[PDB]
Amino acid sequence: AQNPNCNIMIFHPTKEEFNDFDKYIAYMESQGAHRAGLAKIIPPKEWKARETYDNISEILIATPLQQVASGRAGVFTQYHKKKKAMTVGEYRHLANSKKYQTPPHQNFEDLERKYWKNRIYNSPIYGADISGSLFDENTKQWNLGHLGTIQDLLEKECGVVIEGVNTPYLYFGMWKTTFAWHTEDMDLYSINYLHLGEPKTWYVVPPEHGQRLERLARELFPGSSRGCGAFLRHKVALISPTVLKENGIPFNRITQEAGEFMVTFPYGYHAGFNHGFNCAEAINFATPRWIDYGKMASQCSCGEARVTFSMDAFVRILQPERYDLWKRGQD
């Protein structure tokens, strides 16, 4: 069995190996990368996502989200307070303001300490989930707007044609902006490219150990757990590395820098935070190995998780028993 300790693997594909995306995901898995739940891919030196980032300031963040925390430093939830629209140029200025900028620090480890110590006492503003792409249409390799669609994958594997589309999302972050512990919708893969700016630190639980995280989370958020049997789908709960270590939950951490891809694998729980102003792009995708995860994915039917149009068909085809209850939670 490859990668039995479930370490995060880092890959350095050549330009020739960067041509066929599906093939390279399958290669990574042949080496055990999926056991970690997350892998880093450093593109070949010849590659670029686009020529420059000099002309992105007029992109609109229609609903910036202020991330307000409640709880204790290592175990907290966050809710998202909607703010007035602002452009990327306005947002970058805000990120770099004295109120929101990254503090002085020695290294990534120092900054991580400061994050876990102080995150709850501030409410950073995140431009998340903005439909769009920053890949140049002429970038042919690992262009997140040109991947094979999940609907076509389900059709190729299972023979059923379904409605729905699959497009990428932009994330504009600042210091302390936070992504709560989650797996992807329907336990899909995700891929995330850090286009520009300051790093993003990730934490991940090996898929084979996801239920240990879930058990801890039920203990640590006992009201939430009573309200919904899949409340991590709400994407609001944070648990620090110190707390996970105290409770024996297996996990790993890595920092992504600008120009690097991260891939999350089915049922790989992940969480993290941004170091300062940045812009990432991410999209879900599927492979044949995903299908069995899709069939077994938990679902939130309490009404909180509310998700895209395209998840309908996945639930309907892969989880017909669950469909009626899940759809009620959609409506």
Ligand X SMILES: O=C(O)CNC(=O)C(=O)O
CA distance 299 to 308: 14
CB-CB contact of 202 with 148 (8 Å):
no
Burial of 281 (C-beta count, 10 Å sphere; 0-12/13-18/19+): buried
> Is 200 flagged in the annotation as binding?
yes
Should residue 228 be labelled a site residue for Zn ion when binding is judged by CB under 5 A? Answer: yes
Q: Whole-number minimum distance, CB 23 to Mg ion, in Å? A: 34
Residue 240 binding: pick among Ni ion, Mg ion, Zn ion, none (C-beta 5-8 Å cut-off by kind): none
State the residue number with the nearest CB to Ni ion.
Answer: 190
Which residues are near ligand X by CB under 6 A? 171, 179, 190, 192, 264, 270, 280, 282
Residue 58 binding: pick among Ni ion, Zn ion, Mg ion, none (C-beta 5-8 Å cut-off by kind): Mg ion
Please report, for residues 97, 221, 267, the alpha-carbon distance to residue 212 in angstroms, rounded to integers and kept in the order given: 40, 14, 12
Should residue 307 be labelled a site residue for Zn ion when binding is judged by CB under 5 A? Answer: no
Q: Whole-number minimum distance, CB 220 to Zn ion, in Å? A: 16
Residue 68 binding: pick among Zn ion, Ni ion, Mg ion, none (C-beta 5-8 Å cut-off by kind): none
Which residues are near Mg ion by CB under 5 A? 56, 58-59
Binding region for Zn ion (CB under 5 A) out of 86-94, 200-208, 257-265, 299-307: 299-307
Amino acid at 96: N
Which residues are near Ni ion by CB under 5 A? 190
Q: Whole-number minimum distance, CB 264 to Ni ion, in Å? A: 6
Residue 16 binding: pick among Ni ion, Mg ion, Zn ion, none (C-beta 5-8 Å cut-off by kind): none
> Is 182 flagged in the annotation as binding?
yes
DSSP, collapsed to helix, strand or coil, labels residue 74 as coil
List of residues 6+ apart from 97 with CB closer than 8 A: none
Rounded to the nearest 5°, which phi and psi values hold at 267?
A: 65, 25
Question: 110-118, long-range: CB within 8 Å, 24+ apart, which pairs?
Answer: 111/275, 112/201, 112/253, 115/176, 115/201, 115/273, 116/73, 116/74, 116/240, 116/241, 116/242, 117/73, 118/73, 118/176
Binding region for Zn ion (CB under 5 A) out of 61-69, 73-81, 105-113, 226-234: 226-234
Q: Whole-number minimum distance, CB 321 to Zn ion, in Å? A: 18
> Is 192 flagged in the annotation as binding?
yes
CA distance 126 to 251: 25
Residue nearer to Mg ion on the CB measure, 77 or 87: 87
> Is 184 flagged in the annotation as binding?
yes
By residue count, the chain amounts to 331
Nearest to 178, CA basis, from 255, 124, 230, 217:
124
Should residue 300 be labelled a site residue for Zn ion when binding is judged by CB under 5 A? Answer: yes
Q: What residue numbers does the annotated binding site for Zn(2+) cover? A: 228, 234, 300, 302
